[PDB]
Amino acid sequence: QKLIANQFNSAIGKIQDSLSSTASALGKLQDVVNHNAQALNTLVKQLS
Amino acid sequence: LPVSMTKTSVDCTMYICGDSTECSNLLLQYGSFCTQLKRALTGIAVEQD
Amino acid sequence: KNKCVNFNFNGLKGTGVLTESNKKFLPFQQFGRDIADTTDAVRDPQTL
Ligand SMILES: *[C@@H]1O[C@H](CO)[C@@H](O)[C@H](O)[C@H]1NC(C)=O
Numbered sequence: 001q002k003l004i005a006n007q008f009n010s011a012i013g014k015i016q017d018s019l020s021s022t023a024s025a026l027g028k029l030q031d032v033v034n035h036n037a038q039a040l041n042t043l044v045k046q047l048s
Numbered sequence: 049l050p051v052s053m054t055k056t057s058v059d060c061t062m063y064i065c066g067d068s069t070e071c072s073n074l075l076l077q078y079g080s081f082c083t084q085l086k087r088a089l090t091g092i093a094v095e096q097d
Numbered sequence: 098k099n100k101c102v103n104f105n106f107n108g109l110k111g112t113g114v115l116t117e118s119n120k121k122f123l124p125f126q127q128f129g130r131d132i133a134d135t136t137d138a139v140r141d142p143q144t145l
Pocket residue numbers: 143144
């Protein structure tokens with residue numbers, strides 16, 4: 001039990017470290033915002 | 049995993065005609081294009097929630 | 098000024114609120130544009 005608990009805690013800590021270090025991990029979630037913003041921008045630009 | 053988008057609302061007259069009253073009068077002759085547009089946007093908006 | 102009025106600046110017709118601008122136009126600039134080529138600011142031909 002102690003080893004399993006230690007492994008789980010270490011894995012959670014590594015999860016936090018990886019999330020903090022890697023800024024591109026959440027790219028799949030920034031993609032939707034970028035797509036919506038680009039669609040709005042091209043819609044606005046079409047007025048010209 | 050993404051779960052929802054940004055809920056967008058588009059006002060026809062402001063976009064197509066802006067402040068032009070004559071354009072707004074002319075736009076009425078094209079029918080219910082804007083009704084369909086706003087209905088679809090509203091459907092997407094409720095779908096996100 | 099500070100009222101929604103119909104304006105005509107040298108043929109530039111439109112409707113909006115005219116407010117004392119705070120963006121530093123250079124002396125050679127007499128007409129501004131925002132995104133989509135919309136007119137954002139204009140210098141008064143009578144008092145500049
Ligand atoms: C505009 O013309 C009037 C009448 O000649 C004059 O009093 C005024 O100073 C002029 N203003 C400018 C900015 O030229």
